[PDB]
């Protein structure tokens, strides 16, 4: 449910047990409790 | 009704009884056997009269050391680094009571040990560790006999003292661990006597700083000089100051130790300063 840098992804996780409402809850909570407006290590992610 | 005298610091002290359980007996051994919820009124009636000048009196009870409210005025218990400890039993007492020792006390204004056999022929391997084991005693006549015999044996010994050094470390360490300041002073004085009594002894004691010197660190700051400022102390003759004794003993150990005693002493006591370089 999280990447290496500790963020909560964007899209639905495959075979996830939680519903969409709790996913939106977790996303908004994590955006509330962040200390910076963006990840300072975005450029080092690969896919 | 009954009265209880203070009875402290006197001829009859129960303090000296708890330590060294073997003491207290006569010249011979022990004698043969045969010789609810009561009402207390209305304490408070403040209801209906609340006001801002009131504030809480109870404020719960006690405090936990690492809770949210805090530790309050609580303090941890003392470890007792300076608390006096029990004196282990000594081989000197057994050998003296049994009757194998060739010395006896000669009374007088300056006490002196009368020796029934010439000292130079004694087997120091058997005797020197036994006498150092008697330094720990705190009851007459064991104290004077043991310590004066130690001094006499060291003074007249000669070249045979040197191989005895490995056997003397345990009595030296056990004397210092008792945390009795007078025993510490006697041990330090005898150590000062031992260091210079012969040759190549200081170099032999360098590997054994790991066992002796730990007790030096604890007592290097204790001082009896309670006089204020420039007042002189008239009890200097007794040499009962622990700190001066331990400092001068450390300096003597450095001087007679040899090439690399300083690093070992520095590793044992941290606040030391070199006396040579």
């Amino acid at each position: 449910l999280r990447n290496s840098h500790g963020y909560v992804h964007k899209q639905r996780a495959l075979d996830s047990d939680i519903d969409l409402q709790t996913w939106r809850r977790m996303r908004i909570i994590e955006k509330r409790i962040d200390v910076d407006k963006a990840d300072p290590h975005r450029h080092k992610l690969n896919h | 009704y009954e009265i209880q005298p203070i009875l402290k610091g006197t001829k009859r002290d129960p303090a000296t009884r708890k330590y060294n359980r073997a003491a207290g007996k006569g010249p011979f051994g022990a004698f043969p056997p045969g010789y609810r919820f009561a009402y207390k009124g209305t304490v408070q009636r403040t209801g209906g009269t609340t006001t801002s000048l009131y504030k809480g009196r109870q404020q719960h009870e006690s405090a936990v050391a690492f809770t949210t409210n805090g530790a309050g005025d609580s303090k941890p218990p003392k470890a007792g680094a300076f608390k006096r400890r029990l004196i282990p039993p000594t081989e000197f007492r057994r050998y003296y009571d049994r009757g194998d020792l060739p010395l006896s006390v000669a009374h007088g204004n300056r006490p002196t040990i009368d020796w029934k056999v010439d000292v130079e022929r004694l087997d120091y391997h058997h005797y020197l560790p036994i006498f150092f084991d008697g330094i720990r005693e705190t009851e007459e006549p064991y104290m004077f006999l043991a310590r004066q015999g130690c001094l006499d044996l060291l003074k007249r010994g000669g070249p045979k003292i040197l191989p005895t050094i490995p056997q003397l470390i345990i009595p030296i360490k056990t004397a210092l661990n008792t945390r009795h300041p007078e025993i510490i002073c006697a041990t330090l004085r005898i150590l000062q006597q031992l260091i210079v009594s012969g040759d190549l002894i200081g170099e032999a004691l360098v590997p054994y700083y790991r066992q002796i010197l730990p007790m030096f660190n604890l007592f290097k700051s204790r001082h009896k000089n309670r006089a204020r400022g420039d007042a002189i102390d008239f009890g200097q003759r007794k040499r009962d100051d622990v700190g001066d004794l331990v400092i001068e003993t450390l300096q003597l150990l450095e001087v007679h130790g040899g090439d690399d005693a300083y690093i070992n002493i520095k590793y044992m006591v941290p606040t030391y300063e070199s006396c040579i370089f």
Binding site: - | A227, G229, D230, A231, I232, D233, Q251, E273, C275
Partner: protein, 185 residues
Amino acid sequence: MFHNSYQSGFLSILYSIGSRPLQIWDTKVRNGHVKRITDEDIQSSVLEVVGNNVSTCYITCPVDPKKTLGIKLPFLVMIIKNLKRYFSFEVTILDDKGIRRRFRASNYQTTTRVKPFTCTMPMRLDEGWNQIQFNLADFTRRAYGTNYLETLRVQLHANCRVRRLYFSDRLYSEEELPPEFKLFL
């Protein structure tokens, strides 16, 4: 303080013998102690200033920080025994240009440094008992190029045994000193 006194020959303000040796001195002692003890080498009473921190434990003169000694004699002589440890002392003087200057000597200094307020210098002590003769006028002339008028503060730091501190108007030989000033082994 000594401004209105008679100042000629020898003027001494410290002496271990007496009812109140530290009468005109103030003590600032932490992690240390000061006391009067009998010395083994010379068999007489001496003062001892010993502490774990050199800077913290010291004795000053005069007691009130706003007072000045006002002594015009050029030389300062000390009687100090070295204990193979750290030791330092200070003297504050006044020149004819009206500037208060300090002279600090310590046995662990490496290089001499001269500044408009301070001149730090190394100092070495021989084994046993030592007498240190200090020339304020020569040091002032050599350091600042300015004449010397008076001293107005004396300090002493741990660790060192002391018997007497006195001023003199010139150097004296061993036999020219009065008996009470000369030390005997």
